[PDB]
Amino acid sequence: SYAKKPHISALNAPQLDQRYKNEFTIGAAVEPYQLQNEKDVQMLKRHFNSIVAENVMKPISIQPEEGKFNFEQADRIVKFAKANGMDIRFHTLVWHSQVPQWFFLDKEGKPMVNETDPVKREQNKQLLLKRLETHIKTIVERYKDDIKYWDVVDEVVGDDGKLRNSPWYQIAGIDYIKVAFQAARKYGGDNIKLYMNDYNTEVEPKRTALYNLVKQLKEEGVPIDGIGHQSHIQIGWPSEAEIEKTINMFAALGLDNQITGLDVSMYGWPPRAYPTYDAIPKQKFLDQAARYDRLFKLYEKLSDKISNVTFWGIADNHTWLDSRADVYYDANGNVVVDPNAPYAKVEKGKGKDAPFVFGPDYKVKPAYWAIIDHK
């Protein structure tokens, strides 16, 4: 939406959170160093009223060795949010990636997944669940008064629609999910809100598997308050109709919905990225702006079912999507971005994506104008 609207500094632009303040909070994912950068601080103060840590609250960042808790980085994000009246989301108590390996070693130091004795396997289950409870207990006892929203587990359902067969599941079975939510509620009390977070929540068979899993857990009294939809999406996928169907499906269970990691990639999958920001054609930003226009129109339509929309970053100069921005080169060394076209080599993660409404120079994109207006 719209091109005659100018490329002005985002620090001079109408505030994004204020535009949406009766519909949902507007969040950004951050690293501690961005809180030491004048531009990023001014962006967070101007446009956002919710915050989450990109990385410093993940299990391996918090407890890299058993008994060694590293809260200093997480504390800095909590401090900044309190000083600026921001909601905080905790990402994340449990995840199969970025996972300290000590969790899954038995008393003899051997991988628990390798045990064959059923009596010893049950001992490893109880030991892993005890470690899980202590991890969650320590974090929630520190932050329960400060952090309202918790990703209790991330990505526990596989893309094949079965439970993800991570070491958590191999060793402890489904109970690791139940234990995590129960521990968060026990040590955090009734006022913190507990979420199951995942990507491709719109895609079958994952969508209905997520639905059935959460429905069953709530029937058994496991405290789950909502679903986090990571929403790592593309310009043309998934459809707005399928997003709407997903959000309604989970709201029908009585669950809150949060959009927890929104980015709108310029590319498909696997991505064939441009090598630099400057090489991305202007038309891509117009296509992106129209996608954002439709997306936030839908979020507003469903505002009674969505409490928060968080972007997985601040401005286009920093996005984890760049780690996926593979650049394909033909035999003559020219960039290939056509997903079917011939090519000779790929430089993995060397390109540039552009997923936000704010450009890498902190000036507003067409996508910003598309979601700040009321059309």
Provide the binding-site residues for Cl ion, judged by CB under 5 A. 320, 359, 361
Residues in the interface with Zn ion (CB under 5 A) total 13
Nearer to Zn ion, 14 or 111 (CB): 14
Shortest Å, Cβ 138 to Zn ion: 25
Nearer to Zn ion, 108 or 278 (CB): 278
Shortest Å, Cβ 263 to Zn ion: 12
Shortest Å, Cβ 126 to Zn ion: 36
**Terminus-to-terminus CA distance in the chain, angstroms?**
9
d(CA 245, CA 66): 42
> Counting contacts by CB under 5 A, is residue 282 touching Zn ion?
no
Nearer to Cl ion, 89 or 178 (CB): 89
The string of DSSP codes covering 154-191 is ES-B-TTSSBP--HHHHHHTTHHHHHHHHHHHHHH-SS
d(CA 65, CA 104): 12
| The two structure tokens encoding residue 208 | 């209905």
> Counting contacts by CB under 5 A, is residue 145 touching Zn ion?
no
Helices 206-219 and 240-251 cross at an angle (nearest 10°) of 10
Q: Which residue is it, tokens 């079965």?
A: 162
Residues 52-91, interacting with Zn ion (CB under 5 A): 54
Nearer to Zn ion, 171 or 259 (CB): 259
Give residues with Cβ within 8 angstroms of 215, minimum separation 6: 253
Q: Of 76, 352, 363, 365, which one interacts with Zn ion (CB under 5 A)?
A: 363
Nearer to Cl ion, 69 or 320 (CB): 320
Binding partner of residue 149 among Cl ion, Zn ion, none, CB under 5 to 8 Å per kind?
A: none
d(CA 257, CA 198): 12
Binding partner of residue 293 among Zn ion, Cl ion, none, CB under 5 to 8 Å per kind?
A: Zn ion
Shortest Å, Cβ 320 to Cl ion: 3
Give residues with Cβ within 8 angstroms of 370, minimum separation 6: 1, 2, 289, 290, 292, 293, 296, 357
Shortest Å, Cβ 39 to Zn ion: 13
What one-letter code names the amino acid at 366?
Answer: P
Residues 215-254, interacting with Zn ion (CB under 5 A): none
Q: Of 165, 276, 323, 334, which one interacts with Zn ion (CB under 5 A)?
A: 276
With vertex at residue 282, the alpha carbon angle to CA 277 and CA 288, rounded to the nearest 5 degrees, is 90
Shortest Å, Cβ 61 to Cl ion: 13
Report the interface residues with Zn ion, using CB under 5 A. Answer: 17, 24, 49, 54, 276, 278, 293, 303, 359, 361, 363, 370, 373
